[PDB]
Ligand binder design. Structure first.
Ligand SMILES: *C[C@@](*)(O)[C@H](CCCNC(=N)N)NC(=O)[C@H](Cc1ccccc1)NC(=O)[C@@H](N)Cc1ccccc1
Ligand SMILES: *[C@@H]1O[C@H](CO[C@@H]2O[C@@H](C)[C@@H](O)[C@@H](O)[C@@H]2O)[C@@H](O)[C@H](O)[C@H]1NC(C)=O
Ligand SMILES: *[C@@H]1O[C@H](CO)[C@@H](O)[C@H](O)[C@H]1NC(C)=O
Ligand SMILES: [Cl-]
Length: 233
């Protein structure tokens, strides 16, 4: 996260760390006790058996008492996620056990099946354990930045016309760079206590207003998410 601040430990209890070979690689959130939403690009060419999902964390390098660690029983990547395109960057992880919900481990709600994406200017927050600079600096624990939804036409022009209808963008509320960076992927953009976005991609410099942060527009995927969950329940 760029231009953010360390959260109070366990104050975002839906946040998940996806780790490969013991190393944090992506974010995600707890949808149901056995289900985590993350970004499809995080799993490309990855041996799933080397993956773990860590819930209840603040400092990932410490074996904290609130941490609950799970293997991935099943990865379901969006059926329309593909190379040579950036859209549909979303997946579900069915965990090999069920989280015990409590003060440090809880669920984040999706937008409603009939909900629209948030209007430009809407205040949201994005959290993660990704880099805090363009020099691959690690955070001391879970970080969060305050951002605002950016007009999709303005975002699309800044991206030289390459955005699709199921993408949404943000900007900083002020003159500082604020947004996500590498290994924040799959974390939610939370607006009004709903997961309206999922961290997907940005430009050469993290948080650069020339290349606005792009999220998967989660409301477009709600029906599919529930289809997958119901399917294996
Ligand atoms: C994976 C997630 O952690 C990461 C967060 C944003 C990183 N932003 C910057 N370093 N500036 N997302 C990516 O790295 C994203 C991967 C991606 C691939 C395919 C479809 C969607 C998303 N890519 C980027 O943000 C771009 N900076 C470069 C890129 C890398 C790999 C493939 C395609 C583009
Ligand atoms: C995004 O915008 C696209 C067009 O982009 C603009 O026109 C091209 C020719 C270039 O000049 C570029 O720099 C401009 O920004 C549309 O084709 C596309 O449909 C738009 N997508 C959405 C979701 O609105
Ligand atoms: C879940 O998976 C992980 C690693 O794949 C493993 O260490 C753990 O024991 C598994 N849990 C159960 C209940 O099988
Ligand atoms: Cl469940």
């Amino acid at each position: 996260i760029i231009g953010g601040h360390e959260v109070t430990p366990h104050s975002r209890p839906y946040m998940a760390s996806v780790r490969f070979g013991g190393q944090h690689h992506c974010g995600g959130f707890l949808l149901r006790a056995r289900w985590v939403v993350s970004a499809a690009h995080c799993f490309s060419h990855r041996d799933l058996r080397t993956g773990l999902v860590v819930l209840g964390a603040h400092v990932l390098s410490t074996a904290e008492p609130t941490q609950q660690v799970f293997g991935i029983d099943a990865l379901t990547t969006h059926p329309d996620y593909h190379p040579m395109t950036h859209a549909n960057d979303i997946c579900l992880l069915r965990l090999n056990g069920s989280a015990v919900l409590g003060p440090a481990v809880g669920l984040l709600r999706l937008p409603g099946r009939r909900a629209r994406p948030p209007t430009a200017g809407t205040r949201c927050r994005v959290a993660g354990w990704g880099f805090v600079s363009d020099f691959e600096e690690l955070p001391p624990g879970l970080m969060e930045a305050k951002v605002r939804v950016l007009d999709p036409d303005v975002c699309n022009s800044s991206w030289k016309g390459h955005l699709t209808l199921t993408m949404l963008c943000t900007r900083s509320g002020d003159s500082h760079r604020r947004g996500f960076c590498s290994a924040d992927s799959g974390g939610p953009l939370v607006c009004r206590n709903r997961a309206h976005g999922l961290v997907s991609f940005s430009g050469l410099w993290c948080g650069d207003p020339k290349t606005p942060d792009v999220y998967t527009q989660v409301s477009a995927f709600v029906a599919w998410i529930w289809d997958v969950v119901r399917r294996s329940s």
